Design an enzyme around this catalytic site. Structure first.
Site, PDB file in Angstrom:
ATOM      1  N   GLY D  56       0.826  -1.195   0.000  1.00  0.00           N
ATOM      2  CA  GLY D  56       0.000   0.000   0.000  1.00  0.00           C
ATOM      3  C   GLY D  56       0.864   1.249   0.000  1.00  0.00           C
ATOM      4  O   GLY D  56       1.990   1.240  -0.498  1.00  0.00           O
ATOM      5  N   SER D  85       5.317  -6.122  -0.620  1.00  0.00           N
ATOM      6  CA  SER D  85       5.696  -4.704  -0.575  1.00  0.00           C
ATOM      7  C   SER D  85       5.699  -4.238   0.877  1.00  0.00           C
ATOM      8  O   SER D  85       6.447  -4.817   1.687  1.00  0.00           O
ATOM      9  CB  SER D  85       4.772  -3.931  -1.521  1.00  0.00           C
ATOM     10  OG  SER D  85       4.791  -2.542  -1.242  1.00  0.00           O
ATOM     11  N   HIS D 110       9.911  -6.976  -3.371  1.00  0.00           N
ATOM     12  CA  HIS D 110       9.938  -6.124  -4.551  1.00  0.00           C
ATOM     13  C   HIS D 110       8.910  -5.009  -4.417  1.00  0.00           C
ATOM     14  O   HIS D 110       7.771  -5.236  -4.000  1.00  0.00           O
ATOM     15  CB  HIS D 110       9.674  -6.970  -5.802  1.00  0.00           C
ATOM     16  CG  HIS D 110       9.580  -6.182  -7.076  1.00  0.00           C
ATOM     17  ND1 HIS D 110       8.381  -5.904  -7.698  1.00  0.00           N
ATOM     18  CD2 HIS D 110      10.544  -5.657  -7.870  1.00  0.00           C
ATOM     19  CE1 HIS D 110       8.610  -5.223  -8.807  1.00  0.00           C
ATOM     20  NE2 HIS D 110       9.914  -5.059  -8.936  1.00  0.00           N
TER      21      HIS D 110
END
Ligand SMILES: O=c1c2c(n3ccnc3n1Cc1ccc(C(F)(F)F)cc1)CCN(Cc1cccc(Cl)c1)C2
Ligand SMILES: O=c1c2c(n3ccnc3n1Cc1ccc(C(F)(F)F)cc1)CCN(Cc1cccc(Cl)c1)C2
Ligand SMILES: O=c1c2c(n3ccnc3n1Cc1ccc(C(F)(F)F)cc1)CCN(Cc1cccc(Cl)c1)C2
Ligand SMILES: O=c1c2c(n3ccnc3n1Cc1ccc(C(F)(F)F)cc1)CCN(Cc1cccc(Cl)c1)C2
Ligand SMILES: O=c1c2c(n3ccnc3n1Cc1ccc(C(F)(F)F)cc1)CCN(Cc1cccc(Cl)c1)C2
Ligand SMILES: O=c1c2c(n3ccnc3n1Cc1ccc(C(F)(F)F)cc1)CCN(Cc1cccc(Cl)c1)C2
Ligand SMILES: O=c1c2c(n3ccnc3n1Cc1ccc(C(F)(F)F)cc1)CCN(Cc1cccc(Cl)c1)C2
Ligand SMILES: O=c1c2c(n3ccnc3n1Cc1ccc(C(F)(F)F)cc1)CCN(Cc1cccc(Cl)c1)C2
Ligand SMILES: O=c1c2c(n3ccnc3n1Cc1ccc(C(F)(F)F)cc1)CCN(Cc1cccc(Cl)c1)C2
Lengths: 175, 174, 175, 173, 174, 174, 174, 174, 174, 175
Positions: D56, D85, D110
């Protein structure tokens, strides 16, 4: 669409050295007007060019692009206000060759700027634009900056007579 | 729509006039590139004139035009009318030395706006911005430090201060 | 004001043995590109055909259709990358005739595939397609199958000179 | 949403904060408030954090991260489903020895290709470097290996995640 | 609205009935997981019943539920009514052996429709499918070869065909 | 769409017939103005015919046409077919005296509907409204008071009654 | 998508066959009127044929066409194929007496639908219906009463009912 | 979706912790103001804590909160977590001196974005920036010049840069 | 959303505080009117406090509140925080003399923006505009001429300057 | 939303025998108003009911539904116009008990009907509705039909004084 052919009416207007700035001002209008102005000068640097203005205004940088082209070219430019000339429209009207700025009897003129922007900019730059118009307006009406900015601070239209006395135009003609 | 003379945009190309006004996208770059290569085939040495009134656009599309200007043999006169921001000012500054112009009331901005073909990583956005650093430094003759410091400010430049900075060469009025 | 006329500019590029692929690769682009390649081969099976590539990628089967058409025709094919060549764009760039793959100084090359499908597909075919790119890439870069797969998993753009050292293109030209 | 002897209010009574979704500012505020409330109840009882997020907004995730380190509580992070993330950053930020995953959970470091406000290139890079140090801190990996790993657009298995230092225990029951 | 009894969906939870009727997404996953963990806290050994009428959904959300079913100590009775496709049948097949049920007219499908939270790579979607291969093989007691070969066909199976395949054990009428 | 005859709208223009059917906006005004100015170039004093079937439109765009009709030297015969409301009836009443016509079943309305290029203040809308009073009073030969009273009513008038009011002069049948 | 012959719709107008197919609005009305006036300029005495397949439309635009038919000197044969409702049947009934035709399965309705160019008052819509009453009564030669009662029924009529009512004169098949 | 304790956001306000997370608009401003006035009525002397995670918002609404903080007698501790940009950083810097904090990774930006309740003139937006200049200069104790140059750079600041600039006093981790 | 305190907007009403934050429409007017009429029932003459942070709104809805303030017997203290433009400043100026306040950084505008429940004629907009003149002139103690001139300008005024104009009486800080 | 609680403000208005007809008139408003009117009569057939009107009008049949309920119930009805009363709104205002129709000083009154319809109807019926209003308006203002229809034919608002003299209301009060 629905454009008649004569022996094209907007192309035939261009053979009479008449450029139309009707409608709002955006970058596409500016390029199109500018191209016609440069074309008309290439035909004759000395024959007058006519500009019909019936515009509610538009993008400030696009309007200044036209204004700068009018100042650059050598031709005398007769500006004609029909309908109305508001914000940048009235600036182009006021930018005609002195003695050659005309209006029709029921045309409306406004220098107040609308409350327009290609991209988001800060107040330091948006104010630089407003002062940039102040000096341009002051130049062609021959009024002091105090008089130009005060008039433009008030939201109101002028009658074609009133715009003449303020210095935007020279002739309110009927026939 | 577009008026016919003696079509006016084809007539501008008839005078070696390429217009890059309006936003820059991949299709705009392709069209401008096609016109520059066409004009080079007319004469490898006759000057090409390029009119700029752009708020910027896609960076890779701007570099495509920039590399095409550098490739062709013709001298290129850049003319800023209205305003030239982001990629617009880069193309303006990328003109032939001594041949970069602006009209009196034009707005110039080198600051990059916060444009993107696809979503990319942060290292590539930095690789791209560094690419602009070197290009601006090349044609303005300013150090890399002053260029990176200059674009940090979200402000426009007047044609006269843009001339002293090195983006253009002559502010003419006729 | 979308297309200038020359004394049509995109048809004039085709008269010069130049096919340009800028927009994203889809079926309509592929059919149109393919038609020009077969047209240019029918004009001369031996004069080089030129491909200007500036694409962010597109549909994989549509890219392979162009790729397969390039290999089929007899002409030497000079590929030219301007701007960027990503995903299927870089595959088309690398598929040019050896010694005839070029890029301009500030162009971007990416072989990583974006996270492309005319219709919904199963995971098994997506992997078959990815492997299809491995062999095409391995073929034209002369790089190991392993180095291709590990390279494509990295989400990075590469400069024309590291792309030349990698084998995607041959000449980073300077005029 | 069911009622029990409210089911999400009952999870908080068990000192369980659940993320289970994208990291908004609204998610961050709500998560942060729950952590501060649970510390005020007890600075020493462990708090459990359930992660099933694809990531997010980065500044919203760092807001949660800063709150986790701030509080004195041991924090057990549990990744179920997937953690990508910003999600995996929260997972690795649990108390050492208390970061877990379920057998089929997904881990991804990543970064996706932090859009609260449009930002400049210099600041976007300053932000990832900020992420590098946090990952480097909690995995005990060198900065070099962290940056190289994040450049690869691949998911990790819960074992690949345990050996990399993002988590400590892959349990089944 | 939801009818009140003396709330009906909360009354199902009082009877150790978890409902997985509808598409599987992350918000559904949180609710099912929360209810399963809650029912285990009441009793580590009393069976939990799970009603499945789902066309499938997000793979990571379905595996999240699957992992929770394996984690808890309770025996889990799965009941397929209507249909159970994609992740729906995986949860159905993941019930306690001998306690996986279907109604006479339910639809069962292991084929995956043509993981869906965010855009992912080809290797990841293939890794996810391979995880599904092993899970199905574990609970159906079939070899990997027959699992993938079966999944290539999108046919739905009768509660009978699914019982012989190993997805469920007791298809009852009363 | 539009038929070709040995183009029908251009052929109407060859007969000195300008059509103002449909609502009036700035684009309509520009086109009508261009045709009126063009028709004067063929003949200084040959009559121009104007067909009106309009429900009104932008007031400044309507005044732009009105001023052009008054400006040019040609006598202008206005013809109302269908209806002429708001600015439409003003253009109809603005024809050369003795040459303003209507067909038998046409509807005429001078009341203005409750429109502008841009958002404006109360003082400007009243100045425009007063501008309409003076134009209407001039061409109908009615006092300002009776004109203001007529416009206050939300009613249409028949062609033969608009004649007695002074909006038109002849209601023709053949 | 219109086929070309030695344009098919331009070839129809080249033979004095005006088509009123589709709904009536101001844009349709202007075109029909222009074609009628054009056909009269070639010959005030050669008959004009008018094809009607219309479900109705704007009343003021329909009256404009009606007024143009009455004005011109040409005999006008109206032909109903498909259907002619609301203003469509008015144009059909307004043909030259003895020259109003229908095809075997064409449908006719005089009932008015429950529009107009602009929002209007109750008195004005009522002026329009009495205005249509007289038009229908004139050309069907029924008393005003018979028109009002007939239009009051929300029903379609067969071509045989249409000739018997006075709307048309001949229903032909060959 | 908000959890309940002995409401979690109401429990936060019950301890004098006002949250300004999210963008500022008039609806946020009214609520923050009401909470500040309510907390003062319980005690004019107990400190108020204010949590900021805002990307900015409407300037007039931000000034309303700023005016309310200055008005009330309570010492106000502002806490920046996540980020504080545009008006967010203004509220952060407006805390009681010595009581402005940030968390280790919180981001601060004073640059104003390139909005307002209604469309306004260039002079009014400029009155607002000079108005913000004085507010920042007051609480950071830098010259007006230093504020204008700093806000001119489109960059974020680290919490260490923020205390050194005078925006906050303490960056704590525990 | 809205906090509960031992509800915050209802608690403001228990303290005789009506909030007019946000734009004014008929639903806002009804609610403000109801609270004003309700507050009079607790006390015939206890002062009512009115918080204004509004950019304006519907004029008839604004006059509805104004008439209610004048009607009720209570003295009304108006408080401008943030801004009070168009009808917002009218309500602010309509407070009991000596009790109209602003906070230091508030913006005040009496110019009306270029709005109504229904579409209206030019005469009615001017009657409403004149109605605003008389109200403004009454409460500022300014002549009609100076009021009309003030509203003609698209500018905001500072709180301390609105005091000299007569819109408010006291600009307070603490 | 955002409705304060008092010890609910719209429910507390109903304990003071005050019905609100603010906003446009549609079927849902009519049923809600009608239910409150019948409820207030059931509490007392003899205590006055108050109606606050700030409405731009609405559906004609829905407005007549309220009007008929006012005529049916035995209670005296005081109508209060604040803001404005247009079209059906002014009809409800005029339908109050004689001597009990009030307005605030700056309220706007309009009887002209807007240029509203549950379903599509013909002019024979839409005109029946207009005449139906004529007789109702003529009844309560005590003007002849010629005077009512002529006033309503003109698009204009009335000042609270003017509506009193025309007969819509009885008292323009200030405090
Ligand atoms: O009538 C003019 C006028 C000008 N002018 C300049 C040069 N020639 C002319 N003619 C002759 C002409 C025009 C157009 C064509 C063709 F293109 F349509 F065929 C052919 C001949 C200047 C200004 N203008 C004044 C004017 C009146 C009405 C409305 C507007 Cl807005 C402005 C009249
Ligand atoms: O006037 C020029 C100018 C250039 N230039 C180059 C070659 N020929 C020319 N001419 C003659 C010409 C132009 C257009 C046509 C035709 F295509 F429209 F017909 C035909 C002849 C370059 C620079 N420029 C300067 C300039 C001033 C104002 C605004 C802008 Cl934007 C730029 C003028
Ligand atoms: O200039 C070239 C180049 C090639 N090429 C191949 C054949 N002929 C050419 N010409 C001459 C020419 C081009 C177009 C026309 C006409 F059709 F537009 F008229 C007429 C003559 C290939 C190499 N490079 C390609 C290239 C691509 C994209 C960006 C850049 Cl910067 C450079 C230039
Ligand atoms: O090259 C062909 C091929 C066929 N074919 C049939 C008849 N003539 C030909 N020629 C010559 C020619 C082509 C186009 C034109 C003109 F359109 F540009 F004018 C003029 C001459 C079919 C067989 N093969 C099919 C093929 C191979 C590769 C990819 C794809 Cl998609 C399909 C190509
Ligand atoms: O931990 C605090 C902190 C403050 N503070 C002020 C008064 N009490 C506290 N407590 C104790 C407490 C909080 C919440 C509740 C309950 F209401 F949720 F139950 C009960 C007790 C000030 C800010 N500071 C710093 C901080 C760290 C993390 C994120 C953020 Cl945004 C800011 C923490
Ligand atoms: O099962 C737990 C687990 C924890 N934990 C912490 C405190 N109590 C517990 N219980 C008991 C309990 C749960 C729910 C409720 C109620 F509120 F929902 F009713 C009441 C009691 C920690 C995490 N752990 C690991 C875990 C396994 C499977 C999936 C997930 Cl996502 C995570 C489970
Ligand atoms: O019939 C006319 C009429 C005028 N007029 C003026 C000049 N010529 C004419 N003709 C002849 C003609 C028309 C069209 C063409 C062509 F272009 F289509 F070919 C060629 C010749 C004026 C007024 N009008 C009145 C009128 C009656 C019915 C409906 C509409 Cl709307 C208006 C009739
Ligand atoms: O502080 C006041 C002020 C007024 N006032 C009137 C009556 N009581 C008060 N109090 C005390 C109080 C407020 C809220 C509550 C509760 F409801 F939230 F609990 C309980 C007590 C009037 C004006 N105002 C000025 C003001 C300064 C800052 C911003 C804003 Cl918008 C306006 C202050
Ligand atoms: O003030 C009144 C008025 C009436 N009235 C009738 C019966 N009681 C009253 N009261 C007392 C009261 C009202 C509301 C409540 C509660 F519900 F909010 F608590 C409690 C007591 C009649 C008409 N009106 C006139 C009026 C002035 C301002 C604007 C509007 Cl539109 C109309 C005043």
């Amino acid at each position: 669409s629905l454009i008649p052919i004569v022996v094209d009416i907007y192309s035939r207007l261009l053979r009479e050295r008449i450029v139309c700035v009707m409608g709002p001002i955006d970058d596409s209008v500016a390029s199109l007007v500018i191209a016609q102005l440069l074309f008309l000068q290439s035909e004759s640097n000395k024959k007058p060019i006519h500009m019909y203005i019936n515009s509610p205004g538009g993008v400030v940088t696009a309007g200044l692009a036209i204004y700068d082209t009018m100042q650059y070219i050598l031709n005398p430019i007769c500006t004609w206000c029909v309908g109305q000339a508001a914000s940048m429209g009235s600036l182009l009207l006021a930018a005609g060759t002195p003695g050659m700025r005309h209006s029709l009897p029921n045309s409306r003129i406004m220098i107040h700027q609308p409350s327009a922007t290609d991209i988001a900019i800060q107040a330091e730059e948006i104010m630089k634009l407003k002062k940039q118009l102040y000096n341009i307006y002051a130049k062609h009406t021959k009024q002091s900056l105090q008089v130009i900015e005060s008039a433009m601070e008030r939201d109101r239209y002028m009658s074609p007579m009133e715009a003449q006395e303020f210095g935007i135009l020279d002739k309110v003609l009927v026939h």
